[PDB]
Each structure stands twice: as C-alpha cells, then as structure tokens.
C-alpha cells in the first residue's frame, strides 16, 4: 500500500471525516502544505539561529525600525544593510514584498498571462515543465514523489497548527518548547502546562 | 480428555422479559431527526460512518458527564482538575476519592495506584477494547459485528433490546447521547469561563437564579476583562 | 458584472470555498445578513451618539436597575421613563421583547399562521407582499436590488465578525477602534496591537 496511514491521497480514497467536495479544495490543500512547510522550517531555523520566536519576528521590523533584521542572519560576511545607513526599511521591503509576491501569485494562478509562455498551464499544483530543472520529476516514480510531498505537506501543516497553539499556550516558542520537553519530558508537557495553567489559569 | 459437548442449558442471571416500547409512536418530535429517518436539519450528513461516530461520542460523553457529576458530588474536586491528582509523582492521592469506599485504591502507606501502573493498565485494557470494537485487532466474538454500535449479544446481558422495541430504544439512546454531548460542551465552556466545577456552577445558579448566569459572569468578563 | 468580487450569489454558480449544500443556506444567509446589518448599524450609532461599547451595553440594563438606558438617546426630546426610576425595568423590556420577537419569528417561519393574511410565504425571505410600502422593488430592478442586498449582507456580517474579535482583543469598541486607526494608521493596527499582546500577552 502506498499510503498506509489513516487517510489517503485525493486521487483515490473517500476522505473519511470531511467530504471531498470540490477539487479546488485539493488544490488548496497542496498549496497550504507547500507554504506551511516553508513556514515551519523557517520558524525552526529562526529559533535555532537567532533565538527569536517566529510569532514576534514581525515586531522586529516596523515602519520606524526595520534595521535589526540585518545583524540577525548567522555567519554573514557583511551585514544585510549599508552598515549604519540601514537602507532596508519596513516600507522598503514591503513594496518589494507586495510586487514580487503579487507577480509570483498572479503568474501562478493565471490572473495575468504567464510570462514564460512555454506551454505551462495555470491552476495545476505540479507544473513539472520549468520548475524542475533538476529533472527529478521526469526521473523516478513521479506519483510516489507526489505522495511523499503530500505526506510532508500534511505533517508540516499539522506541526504548524501545533506551533501556533504552543505559541498561544506556552508563549515560549516552538524550539524552546522542544528543548524544554526534551530536557524533561515527564514534567514538561501540555498537561503539565495545563496543571500550572497556560498563563491564564 | 474426551469430547463431552453436553448441553449447557444456562439462562441469564437476569433476562428482561418482553416489555415492548415505552414511548409514543412518534419518536423524534425534537429538533432534527435520527439518522436514517429524515434529513439533517442544519449540518450536512458527512458520511454513513458519522451516525456511528455520533453514537460513540454520545456514549463516551454520557459516561464523562456522569463521571464529572459523581466525582464533584462525592469529592468536590472539579473534573478538569481531577487529572492533576494522579501524576507520575504523587498518584497516591487519587486513591481515596469514592464516598463510602470500603477500602482505598492506595492502602495506607506506600501501597498505591501508580500513574504509570494505572496508565499501563489503561492502555492495555481500553485500547484493546477500542480496537476490538473497531476493525483493528480482530473479532473475538464472531457472533457480533465489528463496526456496529449496537451489537446486542453478550453486550446486553439483561436483554432490554429484545425485551422492548429495539428502534425506540435506539433513538432514546441517541437522544440521551446528544443531550449528554451538548451538556459536556456546556461543562467545558463553563470550566473555561468560570474556573469552577459543573456542580459548583449548578449550585451557584440555583441558589440565586436571577444572578449567577452567563451574563452575570460576562459582566465581570469571565474573570478575563 | 453582477458579482465581480470573490465568490458568487446562490444562483450564479458553484461556491468557491464551502459547497452550497442545502437550499435553506441562502435563506439563512439573508436573515443572518439582515440581522448583522441591524447589529453593526446599532453598534456604530450607539457608540457615535453616546460612546458606550455595544458589548458592555448588556450590563447597562439589568433587573437590579434598567434606568441608565432611559434618557440615553441623542437629542431625546421625550424621556424614556417618568422621573420615577421604578417604572422602567429590565424584565418589563424583556417580556415585551420576548413576545414581540417570538411572534415576528413564528409568523416569518410558519410555527403560527400569518396574522397579516397576505401572500407572504413562510420559509421565504423578503416576500415583498407588504414589507415594501413603496414599490421601488418592482419599479426598480428587483434582481439588482437583491444582489445589492446580499452584498451588503455579507459585508455587514463580515464586519460584525471583525467587530466581535476587535472587542475581544482591543476591548475599546468598534467605532473607537476606527478612531484610533485613523488617528495613527501605522502605529495603531492589528499588528501593533498583537505586539502589545491584546492585553493578555
Ligand atoms: C501573509 C502572511 C503572514 C502571516 C500569516 C503573518 C502572521 C503574523 N505576523 Mg506578520 N504575517 C505575515 C506577513 C507579514 N508580516 C509582516 C510584518 C509584521 C509586523 C510588523 C508584525 C507582524 C505580526 C504578526 C503576527 C500577528 C498575530 C495576529 O494577528 O494575531 C493572531 C491571528 C490569527 C491567529 C489569525 C489567523 C503573526 C505571527 C505582529 C507580531 O509579531 O505580533 C506580535 C507584528 O507586529 N507581521 C509583513 C511585512 C509587510 C508581512 C508581509 O507579507
Ligand atoms: C558565506 C559565509 C557564511 C557562513 C559561514 C554562514 C554560516 C551559517 N549560516 Mg549564514 N553563513 C554565511 C553566509 C550567509 N548566511 C546567510 C543567511 C543565513 C540563513 C537564512 C541561515 C543561515 C544559517 C547558517 C548556518 C548553517 C548554514 C549551512 O550551510 C551557519 C552558522 C542557517 C542557520 O543558522 O539557521 C539554523 C540559516 O537558516 N545563514 C546569508 C544571506 C542569504 C549569507 C550570505 O552571504
Ligand atoms: C459497601 C459500602 C459502600 C457504601 C455504603 C457506599 C456508599 C456510596 N458510594 Mg461508594 N459506597 C460503598 C463502597 C464502594 N464505593 C465504591 C466506589 C464508588 C463510586 C465509583 C461511586 C460511589 C458512590 C456512592 C454513593 C451512592 C449512593 C447510591 O446511589 C454513596 C455515598 C457514587 C457517588 O459518589 O455518587 C455521588 C459513585 O459514583 N462509590 C467502591 C469501589 C468499587 C466501593 C467498594 O467497597
Ligand atoms: C439575542 C441576541 C443577543 C446577543 C447576541 C447578545 C450578546 C451579548 N449580551 Mg445580550 N445579547 C442578545 C440579546 C439580549 N441581551 C439581553 C441582556 C443582556 C444582559 C443583561 C447582559 C448581556 C450581555 C451580553 C454579552 C455577553 C457575552 C457572552 O455571553 O459571553 C461571550 C459569548 C459569546 C461570544 C458567544 C459565542 C453579549 C454582548 C452581558 C454583558 O454585556 O456582559 C459583558 C450582560 O450582562 N445581554 C437581552 C434582554 C433584554 C436580550 C434580548 O434579546
Ligand atoms: C487548509 C488546509 C487543508 C486543505 C485545504 C485540505 C483539504 C483536503 N484534505 Mg488535507 N490535511 C490537512 C489540511 C487540509 N486538507 C492537514 C493539516 C492534515 C493533517 C491532519 C491533512 C490530512 C489529510 C488526510 C489524511 C486526508 C486529507 C484529505 C483532504 C481532502 C478532504 C477534505 C475536504 O475537502 O475538506 C477540506 C476542509 C478543510 C480543510 C476545513 C477543515 C476545517 C477544520 C475545522 C480545521 C481544524 C484546524 C483549524 C485550522 C484550527 C483553527 C486554528 C485557528 C484558531 C488559529 C481535501 C482535498 C483526505 C483526502 O484527500 O481524501 C481522499 C485525506 O485522506 N488531508
Ligand atoms: C462529535 C459529535 C457529533 C457527531 C459525530 C454528530 C454527527 C451527526 N449528527 Mg449529531 N449532535 C451532536 C453532535 C454530533 N453529531 C450534538 C452535541 C447535538 C446536540 C446539539 C447533536 C444533535 C443532532 C441532531 C438534532 C441531528 C444530528 C444529526 C447528525 C448527523 C448529521 C450531521 C453530520 O454528519 O455532520 C457532523 C458535523 C459536525 C459535528 C460539525 C459541527 C462542528 C461544530 C462547529 C461544533 C463543534 C463543537 C465545539 C464548539 C468544539 C469545541 C472545541 C474545543 C477545543 C473548545 C450525524 C450523524 C442529524 C441527523 O442525524 O441527520 C439525519 C440530526 O437531525 N445531531
Ligand atoms: C451564517 C451566515 C452565513 C450563511 C448561512 C451563509 C450561507 C451561504 N453562503 Mg455566505 N457569506 C457569509 C456567511 C454566511 N454564508 C459571510 C460573512 C460572507 C462574507 C465573508 C459570505 C460570503 C459568501 C460568498 C462570497 C459566497 C457565499 C456562499 C454561500 C452559500 C454556500 C454554502 C455555505 O456557506 O455553507 C453554509 C455555511 C457554513 C457551512 C459556514 C461554517 C463556518 C465557516 C467554516 C467559518 C466561519 C468562521 C466563524 C464565523 C467563526 C465564529 C467564531 C466566534 C463564535 C468566536 C450559502 C448560501 C456562496 C454561494 O452562494 O455559492 C453559490 C458564495 O459564493 N457567501
Ligand atoms: C442596505 C441594505 C439593504 C438593501 C439594499 C435591501 C434591499 C432590498 N430589500 Mg431588504 N432589508 C434590510 C436591508 C436591505 N434591503 C434590512 C436591514 C431589513 C430588516 C428590517 C430588510 C428587510 C426586508 C424585507 C422584509 C423585505 C426587503 C425587501 C427588499 C427589496 C426591496 C427594496 C428595498 O428595500 O430597497 C432598498 C432601499 C435602500 C437600501 C435605501 C436606503 C434606505 C435606508 C437604509 C433608510 C431607510 C429608512 C426607512 C424608510 C425608515 C426606517 C428608519 C428607522 C428609524 C430589496 C431587495 C423586500 C423584497 O425583496 O420583496 C420583494 C421585502 O419583502 N427587505
Ligand atoms: C469589514 C471588515 C473590517 C474592517 C473595515 C476592519 C477595520 C479595522 N480593524 Mg478589524 N477585523 C476584521 C474585519 C475588519 N476590520 C476581521 C474579520 C477580523 C478578524 C480576523 C478583524 C480583527 C481585528 C483586530 C484584532 C484588530 C482590528 C483592527 C482594525 C482597525 C485597523 C486596521 C487593521 O489592521 O485591520 C485589519 C483587518 C483584518 C485583520 C481583517 C482580515 C480579513 C482578511 C484579510 C480577509 C480598523 C478600524 C485593529 C484595531 O482596533 O485598530 C485600532 C485591531 O486590533 N480588526
Ligand atoms: C451534528 C449537527 C447536526 C444538526 O443538523 C445541527 C447541529 C448544530 C445540532 C449539529 C451539532 C454539532 C455539535 C453541537 C457537535 C458537538 C459535539 C460535541 C460537543 C461532542 C463531545 C463529545 C465528548 C466526548 C466524547 C467526551 C468524553 C469525555 C470523557 C471520556 C471524560 C472523561 C473524564 C471524566 C469523567 C472526569 C475526569 O476528571 C477526567 C476526564 C476528563 C478524562
């Protein structure tokens, strides 16, 4: 069996708890997983590198101050910024964020015409035409690789939901919570935190 | 050893005599309808499995509501803090929690329910039963069907199912199930809002009915505003 | 076109996110919308004219005393109560509103027969038999006015949801949150209040 766990891939199955409904729901699922995966690994890396929890990283960069981000990146040869000048600013990045992500979005979904105009079809999660220069889509069992990615997608989203609920309850951070649990698993758990209260009880 | 294969001819210690239906011919005049007898009033019927899921959550929430009720009546400890008693450390306290108990789970001294001991027994018993109920493990009782919430063989030793009308009893259980689940939801929301047990909230609401309500505690912000 | 924004009205096509399901959902959407129109408009007007938050307005009338509600009307020529505080009462307002709203609801749905004795049909929204003393429904484009009503329904409900979550977070009031936003658009928003922790973090 390809998918021995509880649920099954959309292509074949029944979706036991929630009905399958639209196929756009499956499109969203994959995209949510492909995103949350990047989010979870980014929160992991930010906690490991800087010790700053992900959920307050936005406090760092603000309209008045967005210079602190420059010195955070570990092992960089020169800063992010022009040193004292600190050209990077919240708005400086924001205009860049909105234009670049909006272009990437729209050329993905087909709100605007595809610039690549290379036969790629919008509304498919797996293009496999240009976004795989390495050819791992072409080679190997492509369907099995869709399965693995899906599994990683669902795991990462569930871990993301865990991360947000741990940020709400513990207020410490994902990796800080991981270190607390590993240092002592018996007396550092969700139920131990509930016994102590989540800061509200 | 030879094969005897005699006739047991044993009867149930108690076997309820036919009592039929004790309900009106109309069976769900309440909001909504039982599954397999009409259209769901509001929420869409997710799957055929959802009926059995409703039954299981219902029976579990019945048992949970009665447990919180009896625990608070017998000890005064709220159900949501009763977990803090039996822990890997100092699970001795959880023992003497039953009013009138001739003996303690923890005899005086070291003798005691260990959390891990209790836990290990809990996994080995409840998980086994949970699996045997569902398609996991196998079927130790072939005469019964795994995946059926109403087996009604060895699981009704008193034979109320066959003694009365089966389907009215089924809907009666379903109504009790939905009532207890909604009551359980009320209990968790009350625990969140007031930080006091269900019977404590009941007593506060009956001593002075006009105050000690949702909106009275909301006037204080549920202790958060 | 008719519905250029995201999504569509019940007859326009398939729902993007949640499948349409039962036909009664459209009726619930309209009724909820109309109630949210009333709710948002009341929350605005009460906060603008008086200044009390709508969420704490519940505590202001209580069976211990419901005279603070009296005379708290902008430009009120006629007092709500006599000079006597005793005549106005929380249960006096409650009993009449229970009987009036219960009658209105039962007549709208058909639990009890229509006293109006008009062509207005139960299990139906905006019959228009008598609810529109002015015939601009039929004189104007009835379908255009219906889609406009529905767009306002969805806007008012989404705004009410935002209002309740702002009350839970900011605890200052919807209109008061508006005032704070315009007073300082960049230092007063969600992200700034999240940096403050919504009063809990
Ligand atoms: C689009 C995705 C995206 C997401 C999911 C978040 C999510 C977050 N940001 Mg970030 N941001 C995002 C993009 C961006 N942020 C920023 C700049 C900031 C700032 C400046 C701040 C945040 C803050 C926050 C937090 C607000 C919590 C909240 O609203 O209550 C919880 C809400 C939910 C659970 C709703 C679901 C949260 C971790 C704030 C923060 O750290 O608060 C402590 C903060 O001050 N973000 C920029 C630059 C323009 C972004 C660009 O796209
Ligand atoms: C070229 C020298 C240089 C060196 C020795 C390091 C060294 C390090 N960096 Mg840094 N970085 C360097 C340049 C740069 N880093 C960054 C941005 C980052 C990021 C975003 C991350 C690191 C991380 C790391 C660690 C693991 C990287 C592996 O591979 C390590 C301590 C990773 C880390 O510590 O997170 C756990 C990480 O996530 N670096 C940028 C900008 C893109 C650089 C540009 O020159
Ligand atoms: C044999 C004497 C004995 C007596 C008189 C009582 C008397 C009582 N017990 Mg206890 N118990 C006794 C032995 C035991 N009880 C328990 C475990 C419990 C439980 C689990 C519960 C009681 C409950 C009750 C009450 C039920 C009243 C009726 O109905 C009552 C105060 C019930 C209670 O607390 O109701 C609020 C209840 O739920 N008892 C055990 C262990 C199996 C016992 C063993 O000897
Ligand atoms: C039917 C619609 C309706 C709605 C939605 C509300 C909603 C509210 N009322 Mg009101 N009321 C309503 C009708 C009426 N109220 C009152 C009389 C009161 C009183 C006396 C009080 C409220 C309070 C409240 C708040 C309590 C929040 C809560 O339970 O915890 C949160 C629950 C949720 C978010 C639900 C999910 C909230 C703003 C209380 C208040 O203001 O406390 C702050 C309060 O003390 N209401 C009367 C009688 C005339 C009503 C008649 O229909
Ligand atoms: C938002 C992301 C997302 C999306 C769009 C989907 C969509 C889908 N999944 Mg995927 N999945 C997700 C999350 C998601 N899932 C996560 C996190 C897990 C890990 C538990 C899975 C695990 C999973 C399995 C194992 C299976 C699916 C299946 C399916 C399909 C059936 C369900 C459906 O159509 O309704 C989609 C409806 C929703 C996504 C709404 C969910 C609503 C609940 C209430 C969410 C609860 C968490 C919520 C975010 C909490 C709020 C937090 C907030 C307070 C901050 C569909 C294609 C099944 C399938 O393909 O069948 C063939 C299948 O077998 N998925
Ligand atoms: C988890 C328990 C549970 C389950 C599995 C079901 C399942 C079912 N019910 Mg039952 N029911 C329940 C609870 C539940 N109901 C409760 C508590 C009540 C009393 C209010 C009812 C009252 C009821 C009636 C009156 C009827 C049904 C019907 C049905 C069926 C159709 C609905 C469906 O498939 O979608 C199930 C979908 C859901 C359960 C999702 C709803 C989720 C909401 C948001 C509630 C979440 C609760 C809570 C806020 C979570 C807190 C989280 C915590 C972290 C704070 C199905 C068998 C109908 C039927 O049989 O049709 C023929 C019918 O007529 N049920
Ligand atoms: C309770 C109000 C309500 C109701 C009954 C409906 C019902 C409907 N809408 Mg409307 N809609 C609403 C709210 C509502 N919508 C709001 C606020 C918006 C603006 C965001 C819209 C925007 C909208 C669009 C753009 C479209 C619809 C469509 C539809 C249909 C699709 C089926 C559906 O939604 O399932 C019934 C509803 C549910 C199952 C909703 C469950 C709740 C969801 C998952 C999350 C909401 C969060 C919740 C408020 C959190 C509360 C927490 C708080 C208590 C603390 C149906 C007629 C579609 C349509 O007509 O297609 C033909 C369509 O295209 N609606
Ligand atoms: C802005 C929101 C809005 C919109 C666009 C509509 C639009 C419509 N409604 Mg709906 N309706 C709404 C809000 C809305 N309604 C609310 C909040 C309620 C609850 C009271 C109703 C209750 C309702 C019923 C019961 C019926 C309608 C009907 C109609 C149609 C008739 C034409 C009409 O009302 O002109 C809309 C005109 C305007 C939006 C102009 C502005 C009017 C403003 C708000 C001031 C009104 C002052 C008023 C005369 C006196 C009240 C003041 C108080 C102090 C049309 C589809 C009828 C129908 O469709 O039958 C075929 C019908 O039977 N509506
Ligand atoms: C009709 C829609 C509507 C409108 C006009 C506003 C307008 C406003 N909101 Mg509200 N809000 C809304 C919906 C809305 N919100 C919803 C749906 C939510 C829940 C997610 C919130 C949650 C919310 C919080 C927690 C706070 C505001 C705040 C504010 C103010 C600052 C602007 C801002 O950052 O909001 C941003 C809007 C959103 C986050 C809505 C997301 C909708 C998605 C993208 C679709 C402003 C008066 C802040 C305030 O009071 O400022 C002083 C504040 O603390 N709002
Ligand atoms: C379905 C549908 C159809 C209609 O169309 C419309 C509609 C709106 C009615 C809609 C309805 C939806 C809804 C409202 C769903 C809600 C479901 C819910 C709330 C289920 C709850 C299920 C709850 C369980 C199993 C709990 C078991 C509890 C146990 C073991 C406790 C054990 C225990 C005890 C004794 C005391 C110790 O201290 C410790 C612990 C705590 C361990």
Author numbering:
A (entry chain R), C (entry chain P): 33 to 233
B (entry chain Q): 29 to 253
Paper quotes:
Here, we report the structure and function of the O. tauri photosystem I (PSI) supercomplex in low light conditions, where it expands its photon-absorbing capacity by assembling with the light-harvesting complexes I (LHCI) and a prasinophyte-specific light-harvesting complex (Lhcp). Interestingly, nine Lhcp subunits, including one Lhcp1 monomer with a phosphorylated amino-terminal threonine and eight Lhcp2 monomers, oligomerize into three trimers and associate with PSI on the third side between Lhca6 and PsaK. While Lhcp, Lhcb (apoproteins of LHCII), and Lhca (apoproteins of LHCI) all belong to the LHC superfamily, Lhcp proteins form a separate clade with characteristics of an ancestral state of LHC proteins instead of belonging to the clades of Lhcb or Lhca. In terms of pigment composition, OtLhcp1 and OtLhcp2 each contain 14 Chl molecules (8 Chl a, 5 Chl b, and 1 Mdp) and 7 carotenoid molecules (4 Dlt, 2 Prx, and 1 Nex).
Among the three trimers associated with OtPSI, Trimers 1 and 3 are both (Lhcp2)3 homotrimers, whereas Trimer 2 is a Lhcp1(Lhcp2)2 heterotrimer. Trimers 1 and 3 bind to PSI on the PsaO and PsaK sides, respectively, while Trimer 2 assembles with PSI on the PsaL-PsaH side through Lhcp1 subunit and interacts with Lhca6 through an Lhcp2 subunit. Trimer 2 binds to PSI on three different sites. At site 1, Lhcp1Trimer2 has its elongated N-terminal region (NTR) partially inserted into a surface pocket formed by PsaL and PsaH subunits. The NTR of Lhcp1 contains an RRpT (pT, phosphorylated Thr residue) motif identical to those found in Z. mays pLhcb2 and C. reinhardtii pLhcbM1. The RRpT motif of Lhcp1 interacts with nearby amino acid residues through salt bridges and hydrogen bonds, in a similar way as those of Z. mays pLhcb2 and C. reinhardtii pLhcbM1. Arg29 in Lhcp1 might be acetylated on its main-chain amine group as there is an extra density linked to it, and the van der Waals interactions between the putative acetyl group and nearby amino acid residues from PsaH serve to stabilize the association between Lhcp1 and the PSI core. Sites 2 and 3 are located in the membrane-embedded regions on the stromal and lumenal sides, respectively. On these two sites, Lhcp1 forms hydrogen bonds and van der Waals interactions with nearby amino acid residues and pigment molecules from PsaH and PsaL subunits. The Chls in Trimer 2 and Trimer 3 form multiple interfacial pairs with the Chls from Lhca6/PsaH and PsaK, respectively, which are likely to help provide the excitation energy for PSI.
